[PDB]
Design an enzyme around this catalytic site. Structure first.
Site, short mmCIF file in Angstrom:
data_model
loop_
_atom_site.label_atom_id
_atom_site.label_comp_id
_atom_site.label_asym_id
_atom_site.label_seq_id
_atom_site.Cartn_x
_atom_site.Cartn_y
_atom_site.Cartn_z
N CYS A 40 96.58 54.82 15.80
CA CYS A 40 96.48 54.28 17.15
C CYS A 40 96.71 55.38 18.20
CB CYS A 40 97.47 53.14 17.36
SG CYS A 40 97.33 52.25 18.98
N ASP A 42 98.36 54.98 20.84
CA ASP A 42 99.70 54.72 21.36
C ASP A 42 100.53 56.01 21.42
OD1 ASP A 42 102.01 51.99 21.02
OD2 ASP A 42 102.55 54.07 21.42
N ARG A 44 103.48 56.66 21.37
CA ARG A 44 104.68 56.68 20.56
C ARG A 44 104.40 57.01 19.10
NH1 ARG A 44 106.38 50.87 22.82
NH2 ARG A 44 104.16 50.68 22.23
N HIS A 96 100.77 50.75 13.36
CA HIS A 96 102.20 50.75 13.65
C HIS A 96 102.67 49.38 14.10
CE1 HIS A 96 101.73 50.82 18.12
NE2 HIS A 96 100.57 51.37 17.79
N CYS A 99 102.14 47.12 17.91
CA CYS A 99 100.88 47.61 18.48
C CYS A 99 100.37 46.66 19.55
CB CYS A 99 99.84 47.81 17.38
SG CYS A 99 98.26 48.57 17.91
#
Ligand SMILES: [Zn+2]
Length: 209
Positions: A40, A42, A44, A96, A99
């Site tokens: 992803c 993302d 993080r 993850h 998400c």
């Protein structure tokens, strides 16, 4: 300002050259990663840091909710470059927990273009409506869907003709499913690894060219 980023870069480049002045020069000659990461976007979930890899180790694709579609030449070209040109040995499909793409697919708000992108996750939420309904908190439903998504995407990668043709010509190639916890920093194996044609349902198997 972008000042800090430029400054971070000049400090990082210099630090590495101090420890090994040939570091970048050597790397620049040949790209030889053993792994492709599909994850992803993302912020993080930075691939290299999470598994302690260095520049040169990890070929990377990141998109919203780490979705792999058989008509998407974006993700597919990364896979094909990785498998055919670089000959990576492993594809690491990493979703993850928490998400937002997966989360959005569980709710009914329109987010625009992303709505169509996330369709296949929404399909997953519907086929497992019975299972998901029997989980109490939304957090649980989301996190399970995150796992279901990864397992599905592992299937999607392994069903590509890119990956099957690698196997046909005797290339060693494993597709793994993992899930990262943004709450704890832990990268966990979902143990759904596919490494050969014999593991595919007959309906998805393609004959060699
Ligand atoms: Zn995500």
């Amino acid at each position: 300002a972008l000042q800090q980023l430029f400054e971070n870069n000049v400090r990082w480049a210099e630090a590495i050259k101090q420890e090994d002045p040939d570091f970048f020069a050597k790397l620049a000659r040949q790209q030889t990663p053993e792994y492709l990461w599909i994850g992803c976007s993302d912020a993080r979930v930075p691939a290299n840091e999470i598994v302690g890899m260095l520049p040169g180790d990890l070929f990377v694709h990141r998109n919203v909710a780490n979705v792999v579609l058989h008509t998407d030449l974006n993700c597919l070209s990364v896979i094909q470059f990785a498998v055919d040109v670089l000959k990576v040995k492993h594809i690491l499909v990493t979703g993850h927990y928490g998400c937002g793409g997966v989360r959005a697919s569980l709710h009914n708000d329109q987010l625009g273009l992303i709505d169509g992108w996330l369709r296949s996750i929404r399909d997953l939420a519907y086929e497992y409506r019975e299972h998901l309904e029997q989980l109490p908190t939304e957090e649980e439903r989301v996190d399970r869907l995150c796992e279901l998504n990864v397992i599905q995407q592992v299937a999607n990668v392994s069903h590509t003709s890119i990956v099957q043709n690698a196997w046909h010509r005797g290339q060693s190639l494993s597709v793994h499913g993992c899930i990262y916890g943004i709450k704890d920093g832990l990268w966990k194996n979902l143990n759904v690894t596919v490494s050969g044609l014999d593991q595919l349902p007959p309906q998805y198997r393609l004959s060699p060219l």
